[PDB]
C-alpha cells in the first residue's frame with residue numbers, strides 16, 4: 001500500500017451559541033450551502049483528516065465526539081479514529097482521521113492559551129493540536145477572539161498572544177513560534193472581526209446580502225482590512241469569501257439577521273459580519289489548495305452558521321536511507337553565498353544565525369555577521385561566504401528538494417531571536433547558485449529580511 005503524497009483536510013468552525021446541535025449536521029462535513037461548495041460526486045469520498053473547531057460549545061467531549069463520529073460514519077461508512085480532543089472553557093478542537101492513517105500519525109500535541117487580564121480573562125482564547133503525518137508536520141488552531149465591532153485592536157492583540165504562547169510542535173524549534181513550526185498551519189475560529197459600516201446602514205447591509213452583493217461589505221470587513229495593513233495574520237492566506245455573513249442570525253431560521261442592540265448584547269449592535277473564518281500558512285512551495293470555503297444553510301440552532309473549508313495538502317513519506325537517519329550522507333550539502341539580514345531593530349549587538357531543519361541531525365549555529373549601516377537607516381548584517389556548510393542526513397534529491405530550512409537571527413548579547421523565517425530547498429537546479437529570500441518576523445510581526453544565494457548538492 002503506497003504512502004500518500006497528497007491528503008485532503010476538512011476544517012470546520014462553528015460557534016454553537018451554547019445550544020445543542022440539530023439531529024442532522026452532515027451538510028457541514030459535505031461542504032454544502034453557500035460559497036465555494038464541494039461537488040455532489042465527492043459526497044461519499046472521505047477526507048483524510050477532519051478538524052472541528054467549536055466556540056460556545058455546550059456539549060461534553062463525549063457527547064460531541066458521538067455526534068461527530070456518527071455523522072461521518074453516515075456520510076462515508078468509515079469509522080474515524082480520534083487523534084486528539086482539547087477543550088478550554090467552551091472552545092474545543094476535535095481531530096479525526098481515517099483508520100488507515102493511525103500508524104502515519106505521531107507526536108500528537110495539544111495546548112490552549114487564555115487571552116486577556118482580570119475582566120477580560122475567563123472565556124476567550126484558543127485551543128490547538130499538532131502532529132506529524134509521515135514526514136509532514138500539521139498544526140491546527142481554533143481561536144475565539146474578543147467580540148464587539150469596536151475591539152479590532154484587542155482581537156489583533158489576542159492573535160499575537162495566541163501565536164506567542166501556544167506550545168505546539170517540536171519543542172527543539174525553540175526560536176520559532178507556531179507560525180514557523182509546521183509544514184501546514186490552519187488557523188480558524190470565531191475570530192469576531194466585523195463589517196465596519198455605520199449602525200444606520202443595517203437595513204442597507206441586509207438588502208445587499210439578499211441580493212448576494214458582498215463586494216461593498218467585504219471592503220469593510222475588519223479582518224481583510226487589518227490583514228491588508230499588516231496588523232494581523234501576516235503571511236496567512238484566506239480563500240475568497242462568496243457566502244453571506246455567518247453572524248448574527250435569529251435562531252431556528254436563516255431568514256433574519258438580528259443586529260439591533262438588546263440588554264442581552266450589552267446594548268451593542270451586531271451588524272452582519274463574517275465572524276467565522278479559516279486561514280492557513282504553509283511552508284514555501286508546498287502544495288496547498290483550498291477546494292471549498294463556505295457556510296451551511298440548514299443548521300440553525302445557533303446565531304452563527306457553521307463554516308467549512310477543505311484543502312488538498314502535500315505530504316512527504318518517512319524517508320529511510322542506508323545512511324540517515326542516524327548518520328549524515330556525505331553526498332549531500334547546503335551552502336549559503338552572499339547572505340545578509342536586513343533588520344528593523346535600533347539595537348547594536350552582534351548577531352548570529354541558527355539553521356533548524358529535520359534534514360539536519362541538530363540545528364547549526366553560525367559565526368557572528370558583520371554589521372553595516374543601510375542607506376535608509378537600517379541594520380544590515382553581512383554573512384558573506386562565512387556561513388557553515390549544512391550536512392543533511394539524506395542526500396537523495398527525492399527527499400532533500402522537499403525539505404525546508406528555518407532561520408533565526410539571534411543577538412550575541414541576549415541569545416534572543418530578532419527574526420525568524422523559512423527557505424524552501426525546492427530549487428530550480430542543484431549544484432547551481434540561486435537566489436533565496438525570506439521575510440523575518442518575531443512574535444508574528446515583520447522585523448526584517450534574509451536574502452542571499454544557495455547551492456544545493458544532492459546524490460544526483
Ligand SMILES: Cc1nc[nH]c1CN1CCc2ccccc2C1
Nearest residue numbers: 224225226227228229235236237
Ligand atoms: C503577496 C501575496 N501573495 C500571496 N498572498 C499574498 C498576501 N496577500 C496579498 C494581498 C492581500 C490583500 C488584503 C489582505 C491580505 C493580503 C495578503
